[PDB]
PDB file of C-alpha atoms in Angstrom:
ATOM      1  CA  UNK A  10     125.969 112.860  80.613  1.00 24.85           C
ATOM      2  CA  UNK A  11     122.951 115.096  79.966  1.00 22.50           C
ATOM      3  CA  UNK A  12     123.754 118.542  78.069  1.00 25.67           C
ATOM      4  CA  UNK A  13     122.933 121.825  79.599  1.00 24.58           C
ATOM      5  CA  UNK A  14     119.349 122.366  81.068  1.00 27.39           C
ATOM      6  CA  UNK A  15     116.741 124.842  79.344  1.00 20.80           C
ATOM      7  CA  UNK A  16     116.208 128.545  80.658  1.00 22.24           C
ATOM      8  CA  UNK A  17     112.811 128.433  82.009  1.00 24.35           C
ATOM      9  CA  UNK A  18     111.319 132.635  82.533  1.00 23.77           C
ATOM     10  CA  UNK A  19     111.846 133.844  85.697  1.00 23.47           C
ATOM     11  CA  UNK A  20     114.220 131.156  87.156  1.00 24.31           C
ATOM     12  CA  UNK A  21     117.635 129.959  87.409  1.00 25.96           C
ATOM     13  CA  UNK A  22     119.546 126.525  88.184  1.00 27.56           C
ATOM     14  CA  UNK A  23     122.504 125.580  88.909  1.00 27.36           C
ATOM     15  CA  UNK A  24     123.059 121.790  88.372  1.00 24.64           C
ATOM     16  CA  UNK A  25     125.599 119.882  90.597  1.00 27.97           C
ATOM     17  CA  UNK A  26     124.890 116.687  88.832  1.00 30.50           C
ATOM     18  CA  UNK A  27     124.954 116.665  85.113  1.00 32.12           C
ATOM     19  CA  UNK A  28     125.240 112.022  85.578  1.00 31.55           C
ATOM     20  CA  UNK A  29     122.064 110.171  84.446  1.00 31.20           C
ATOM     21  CA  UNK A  30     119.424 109.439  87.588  1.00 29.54           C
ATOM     22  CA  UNK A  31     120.219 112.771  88.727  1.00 34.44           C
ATOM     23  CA  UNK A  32     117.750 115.396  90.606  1.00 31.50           C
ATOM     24  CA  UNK A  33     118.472 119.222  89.724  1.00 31.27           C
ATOM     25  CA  UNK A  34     115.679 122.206  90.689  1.00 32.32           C
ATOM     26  CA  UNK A  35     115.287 125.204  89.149  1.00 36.30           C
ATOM     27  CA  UNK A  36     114.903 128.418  91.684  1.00 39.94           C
ATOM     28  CA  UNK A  37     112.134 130.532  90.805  1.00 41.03           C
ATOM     29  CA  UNK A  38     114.012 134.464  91.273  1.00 40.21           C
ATOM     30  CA  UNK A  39     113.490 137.095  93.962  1.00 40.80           C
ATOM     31  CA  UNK A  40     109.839 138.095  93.808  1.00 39.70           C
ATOM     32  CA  UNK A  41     108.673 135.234  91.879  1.00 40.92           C
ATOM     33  CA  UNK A  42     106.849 132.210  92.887  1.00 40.26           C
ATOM     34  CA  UNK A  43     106.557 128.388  91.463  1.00 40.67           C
ATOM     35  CA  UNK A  44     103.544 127.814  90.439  1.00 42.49           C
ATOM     36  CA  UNK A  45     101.025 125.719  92.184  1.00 42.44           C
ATOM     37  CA  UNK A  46     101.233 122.336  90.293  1.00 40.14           C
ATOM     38  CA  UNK A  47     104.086 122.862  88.545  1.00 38.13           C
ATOM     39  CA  UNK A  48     107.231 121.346  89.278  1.00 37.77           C
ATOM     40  CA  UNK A  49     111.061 122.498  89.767  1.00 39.06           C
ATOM     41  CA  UNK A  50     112.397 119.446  88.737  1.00 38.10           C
ATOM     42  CA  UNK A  51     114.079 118.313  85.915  1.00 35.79           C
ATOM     43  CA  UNK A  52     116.287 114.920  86.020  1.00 35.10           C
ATOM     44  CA  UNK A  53     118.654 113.123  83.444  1.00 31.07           C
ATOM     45  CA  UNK A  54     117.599 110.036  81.837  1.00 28.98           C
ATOM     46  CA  UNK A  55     119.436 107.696  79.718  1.00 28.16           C
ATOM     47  CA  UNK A  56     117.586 106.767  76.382  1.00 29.38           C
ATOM     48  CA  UNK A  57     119.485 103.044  76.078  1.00 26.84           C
ATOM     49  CA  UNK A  58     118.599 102.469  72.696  1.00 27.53           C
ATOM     50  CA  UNK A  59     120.985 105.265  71.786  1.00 23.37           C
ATOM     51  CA  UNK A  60     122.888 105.852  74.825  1.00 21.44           C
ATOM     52  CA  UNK A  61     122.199 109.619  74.731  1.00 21.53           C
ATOM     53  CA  UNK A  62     120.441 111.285  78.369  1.00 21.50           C
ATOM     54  CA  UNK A  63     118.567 114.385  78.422  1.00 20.96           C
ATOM     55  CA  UNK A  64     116.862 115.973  81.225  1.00 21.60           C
ATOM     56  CA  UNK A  65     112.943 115.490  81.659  1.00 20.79           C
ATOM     57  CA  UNK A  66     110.735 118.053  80.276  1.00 19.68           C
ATOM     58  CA  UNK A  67     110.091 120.950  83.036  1.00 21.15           C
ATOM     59  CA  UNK A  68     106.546 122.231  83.894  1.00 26.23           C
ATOM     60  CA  UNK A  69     107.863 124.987  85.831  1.00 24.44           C
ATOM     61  CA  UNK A  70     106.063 128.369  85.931  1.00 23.95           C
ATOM     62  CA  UNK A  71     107.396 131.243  87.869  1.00 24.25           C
ATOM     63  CA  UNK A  72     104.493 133.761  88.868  1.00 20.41           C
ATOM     64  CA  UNK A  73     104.652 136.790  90.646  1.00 18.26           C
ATOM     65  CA  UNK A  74     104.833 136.656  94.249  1.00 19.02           C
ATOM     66  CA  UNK A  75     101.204 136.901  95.389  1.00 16.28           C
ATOM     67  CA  UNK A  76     102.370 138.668  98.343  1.00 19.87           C
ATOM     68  CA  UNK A  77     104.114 141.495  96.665  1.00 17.09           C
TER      69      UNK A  77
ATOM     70  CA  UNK B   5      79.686 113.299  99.945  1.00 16.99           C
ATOM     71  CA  UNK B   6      81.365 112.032 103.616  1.00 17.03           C
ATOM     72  CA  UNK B   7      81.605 108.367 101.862  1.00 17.50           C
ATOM     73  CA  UNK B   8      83.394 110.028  99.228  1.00 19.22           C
ATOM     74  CA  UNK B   9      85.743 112.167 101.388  1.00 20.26           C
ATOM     75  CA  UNK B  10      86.412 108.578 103.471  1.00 18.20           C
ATOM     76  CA  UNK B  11      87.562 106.682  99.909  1.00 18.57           C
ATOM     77  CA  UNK B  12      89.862 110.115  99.639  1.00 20.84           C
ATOM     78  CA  UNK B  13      91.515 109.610 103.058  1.00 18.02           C
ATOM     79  CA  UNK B  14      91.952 105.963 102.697  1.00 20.54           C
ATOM     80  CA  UNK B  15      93.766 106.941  99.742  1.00 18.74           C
ATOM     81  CA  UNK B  16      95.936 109.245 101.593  1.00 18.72           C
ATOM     82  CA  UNK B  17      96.415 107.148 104.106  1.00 17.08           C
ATOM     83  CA  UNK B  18      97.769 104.622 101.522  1.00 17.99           C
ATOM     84  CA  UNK B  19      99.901 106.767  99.774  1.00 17.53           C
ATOM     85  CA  UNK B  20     101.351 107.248 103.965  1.00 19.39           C
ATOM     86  CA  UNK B  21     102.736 104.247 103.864  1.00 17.34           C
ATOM     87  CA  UNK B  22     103.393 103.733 100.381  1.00 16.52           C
ATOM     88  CA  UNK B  23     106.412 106.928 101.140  1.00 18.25           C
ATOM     89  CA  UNK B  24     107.948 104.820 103.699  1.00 18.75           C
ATOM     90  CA  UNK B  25     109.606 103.000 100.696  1.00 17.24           C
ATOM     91  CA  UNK B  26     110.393 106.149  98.355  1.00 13.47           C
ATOM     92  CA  UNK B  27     112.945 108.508  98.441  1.00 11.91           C
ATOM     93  CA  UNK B  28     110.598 112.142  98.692  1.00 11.70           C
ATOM     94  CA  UNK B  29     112.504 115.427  98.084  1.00 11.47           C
ATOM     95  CA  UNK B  30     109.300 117.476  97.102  1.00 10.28           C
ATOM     96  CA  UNK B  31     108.154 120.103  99.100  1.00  7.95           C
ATOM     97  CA  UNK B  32     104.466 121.439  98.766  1.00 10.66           C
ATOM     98  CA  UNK B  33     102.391 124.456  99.140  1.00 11.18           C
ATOM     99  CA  UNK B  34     100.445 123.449 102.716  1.00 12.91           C
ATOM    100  CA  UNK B  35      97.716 124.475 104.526  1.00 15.26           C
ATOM    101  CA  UNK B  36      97.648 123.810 107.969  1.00 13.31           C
ATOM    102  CA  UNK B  37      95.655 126.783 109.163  1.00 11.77           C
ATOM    103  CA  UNK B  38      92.997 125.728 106.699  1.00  7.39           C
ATOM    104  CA  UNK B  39      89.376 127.292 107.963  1.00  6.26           C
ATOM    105  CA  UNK B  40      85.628 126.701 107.001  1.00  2.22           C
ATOM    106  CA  UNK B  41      85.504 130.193 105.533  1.00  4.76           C
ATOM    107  CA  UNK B  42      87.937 129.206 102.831  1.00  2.53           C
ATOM    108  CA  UNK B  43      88.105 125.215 103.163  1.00  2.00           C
ATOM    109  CA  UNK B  44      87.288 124.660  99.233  1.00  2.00           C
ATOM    110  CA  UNK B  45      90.377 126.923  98.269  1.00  2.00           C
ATOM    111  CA  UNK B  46      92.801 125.536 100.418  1.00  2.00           C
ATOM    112  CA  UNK B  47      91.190 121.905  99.604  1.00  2.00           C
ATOM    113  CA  UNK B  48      91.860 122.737  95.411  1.00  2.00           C
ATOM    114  CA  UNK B  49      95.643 123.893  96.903  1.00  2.00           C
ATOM    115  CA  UNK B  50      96.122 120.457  98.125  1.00  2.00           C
ATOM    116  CA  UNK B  51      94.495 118.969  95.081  1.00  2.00           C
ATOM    117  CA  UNK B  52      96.304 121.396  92.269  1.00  2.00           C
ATOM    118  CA  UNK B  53      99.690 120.189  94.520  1.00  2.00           C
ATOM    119  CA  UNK B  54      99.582 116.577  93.648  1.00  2.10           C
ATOM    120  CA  UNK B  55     100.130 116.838  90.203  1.00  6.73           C
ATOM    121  CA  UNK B  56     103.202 118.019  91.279  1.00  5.16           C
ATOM    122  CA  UNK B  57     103.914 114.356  92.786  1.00  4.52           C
ATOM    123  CA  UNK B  58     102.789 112.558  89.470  1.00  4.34           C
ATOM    124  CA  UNK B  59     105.121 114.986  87.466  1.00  4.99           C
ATOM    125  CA  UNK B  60     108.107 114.103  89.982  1.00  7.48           C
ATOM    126  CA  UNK B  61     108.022 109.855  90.337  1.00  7.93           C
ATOM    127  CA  UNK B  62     107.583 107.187  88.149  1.00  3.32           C
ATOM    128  CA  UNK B  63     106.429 104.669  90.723  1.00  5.22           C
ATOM    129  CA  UNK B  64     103.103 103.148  89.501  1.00  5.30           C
ATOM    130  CA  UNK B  65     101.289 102.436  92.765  1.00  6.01           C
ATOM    131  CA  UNK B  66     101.755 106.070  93.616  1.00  9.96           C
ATOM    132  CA  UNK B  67     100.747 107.715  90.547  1.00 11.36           C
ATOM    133  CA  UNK B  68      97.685 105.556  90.652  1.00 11.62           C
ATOM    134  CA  UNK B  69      96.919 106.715  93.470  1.00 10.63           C
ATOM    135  CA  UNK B  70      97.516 109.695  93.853  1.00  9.13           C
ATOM    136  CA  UNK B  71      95.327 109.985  90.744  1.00  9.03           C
ATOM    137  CA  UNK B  72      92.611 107.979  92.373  1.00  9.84           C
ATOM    138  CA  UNK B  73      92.307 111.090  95.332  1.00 12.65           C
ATOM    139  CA  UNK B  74      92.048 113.466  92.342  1.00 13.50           C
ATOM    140  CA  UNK B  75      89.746 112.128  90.441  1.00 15.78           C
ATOM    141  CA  UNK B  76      87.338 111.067  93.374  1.00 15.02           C
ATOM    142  CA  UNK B  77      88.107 114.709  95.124  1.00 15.82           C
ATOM    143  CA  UNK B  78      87.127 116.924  91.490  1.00 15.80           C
ATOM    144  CA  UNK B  79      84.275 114.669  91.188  1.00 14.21           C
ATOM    145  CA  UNK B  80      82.871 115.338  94.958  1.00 16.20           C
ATOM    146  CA  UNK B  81      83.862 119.167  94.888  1.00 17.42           C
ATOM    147  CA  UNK B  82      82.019 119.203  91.599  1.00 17.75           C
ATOM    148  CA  UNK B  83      79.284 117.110  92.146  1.00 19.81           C
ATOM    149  CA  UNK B  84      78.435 118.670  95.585  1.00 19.23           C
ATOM    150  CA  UNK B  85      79.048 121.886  94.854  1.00 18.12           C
ATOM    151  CA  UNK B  86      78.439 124.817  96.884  1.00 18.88           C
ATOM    152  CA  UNK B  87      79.199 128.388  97.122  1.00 18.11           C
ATOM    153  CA  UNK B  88      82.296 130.613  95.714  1.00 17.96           C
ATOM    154  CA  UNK B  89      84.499 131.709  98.625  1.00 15.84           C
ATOM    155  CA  UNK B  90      86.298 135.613  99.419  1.00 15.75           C
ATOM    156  CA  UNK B  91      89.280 136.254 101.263  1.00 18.34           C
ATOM    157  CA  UNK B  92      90.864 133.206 100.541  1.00 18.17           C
ATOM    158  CA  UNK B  93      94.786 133.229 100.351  1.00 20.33           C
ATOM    159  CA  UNK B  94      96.147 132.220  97.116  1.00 22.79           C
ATOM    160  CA  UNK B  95      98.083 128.707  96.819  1.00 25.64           C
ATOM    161  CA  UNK B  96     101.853 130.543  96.088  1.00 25.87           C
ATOM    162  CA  UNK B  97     101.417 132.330  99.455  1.00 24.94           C
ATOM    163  CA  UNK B  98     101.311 129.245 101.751  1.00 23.02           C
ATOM    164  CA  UNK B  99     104.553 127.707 102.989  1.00 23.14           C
ATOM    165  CA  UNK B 100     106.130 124.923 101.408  1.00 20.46           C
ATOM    166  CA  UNK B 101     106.484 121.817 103.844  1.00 22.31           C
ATOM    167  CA  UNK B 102     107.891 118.019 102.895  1.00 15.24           C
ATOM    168  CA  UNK B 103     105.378 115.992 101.087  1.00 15.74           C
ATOM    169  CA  UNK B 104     104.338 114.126 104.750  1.00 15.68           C
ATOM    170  CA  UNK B 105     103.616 117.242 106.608  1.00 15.58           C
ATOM    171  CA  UNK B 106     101.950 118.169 103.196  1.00 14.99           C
ATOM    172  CA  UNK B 107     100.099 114.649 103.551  1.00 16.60           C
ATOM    173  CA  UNK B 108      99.166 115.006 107.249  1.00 16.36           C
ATOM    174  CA  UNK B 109      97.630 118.061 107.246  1.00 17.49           C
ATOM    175  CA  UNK B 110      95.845 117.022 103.991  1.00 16.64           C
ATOM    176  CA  UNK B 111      94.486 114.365 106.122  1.00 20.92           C
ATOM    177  CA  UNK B 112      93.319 116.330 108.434  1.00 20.01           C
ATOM    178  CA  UNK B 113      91.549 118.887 105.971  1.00 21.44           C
ATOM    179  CA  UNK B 114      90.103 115.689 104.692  1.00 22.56           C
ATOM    180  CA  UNK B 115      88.876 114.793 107.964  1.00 24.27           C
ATOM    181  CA  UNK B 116      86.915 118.476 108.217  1.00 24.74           C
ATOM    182  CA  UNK B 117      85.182 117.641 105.573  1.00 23.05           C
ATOM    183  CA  UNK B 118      83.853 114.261 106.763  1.00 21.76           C
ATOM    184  CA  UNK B 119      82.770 115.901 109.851  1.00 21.44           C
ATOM    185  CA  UNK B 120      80.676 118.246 108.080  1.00 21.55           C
ATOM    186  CA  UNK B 121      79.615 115.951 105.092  1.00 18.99           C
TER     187      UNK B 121
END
């Protein structure tokens, strides 16, 4: 199983799935925005070699709401 | 630049059916009210949005592919470049649809700019 995720600024996540091949997605907060090009997703990934998962690097950036 | 804008939509035509085989649970910044006074902004939206796609699947036709539109599409908008647009809604603003609405109506900006290549 894949430890817990990183905080990433801005955002929160609450993963259902902690099982390798699974999908979780950060939630950028109230007022903030993800990030055109960026991505919420993070997923866990076995490493075979040493049977150890972790979860994918995130490129996640919450901005300010343009619209506030 | 219209030849270059048709190898683009041949691309995302591709990538159409390509999804019919992939699990998608991304959902994009789209812009389907996209307008001549602001078509280059809302085409680098769609553009800056597919990274997204090669950050979220590890299938190697798509990334290729996707990649193909992006480098062909920065290489047009910079090559043929003209002026620097006002007014222009920001990317985060737009609202997020599934990656084939996303597609269509990237298709159809596509498609404006073929018309008036």
């Amino acid at each position: 199983t894949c430890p817990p995720p990183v905080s990433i600024e801005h955002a929160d996540i609450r993963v259902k799935n902690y099982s390798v091949n699974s999908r979780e997605r950060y939630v950028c907060n109230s007022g903030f925005k993800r990030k055109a090009g960026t991505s919420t997703l993070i997923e866990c990934v076995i490493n075979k070699n040493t049977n150890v998962a972790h979860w994918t690097t995130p490129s996640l950036k919450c901005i300010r709401d343009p619209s506030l | 630049s219209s030849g270059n804008w048709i190898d683009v939509r041949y691309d995302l035509e591709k990538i159409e059916s390509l999804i019919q085989s992939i699990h998608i649970d991304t959902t994009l910044y789209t812009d389907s009210d996209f307008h001549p006074s602001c078509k280059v902004t809302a085409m680098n939206c769609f553009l800056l949005e597919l990274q997204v796609i090669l950050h979220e699947y590890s299938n190697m036709t798509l990334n290729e592919t996707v990649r193909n539109v992006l480098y062909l599409a920065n290489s047009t908008l910079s090559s043929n470049k003209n002026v620097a647009e006002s007014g222009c809604k920001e990317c985060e603003e737009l609202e997020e649809k599934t990656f084939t609405e996303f597609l269509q109506s990237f298709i159809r900006i596509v498609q404006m700019f073929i018309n008036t290549s």
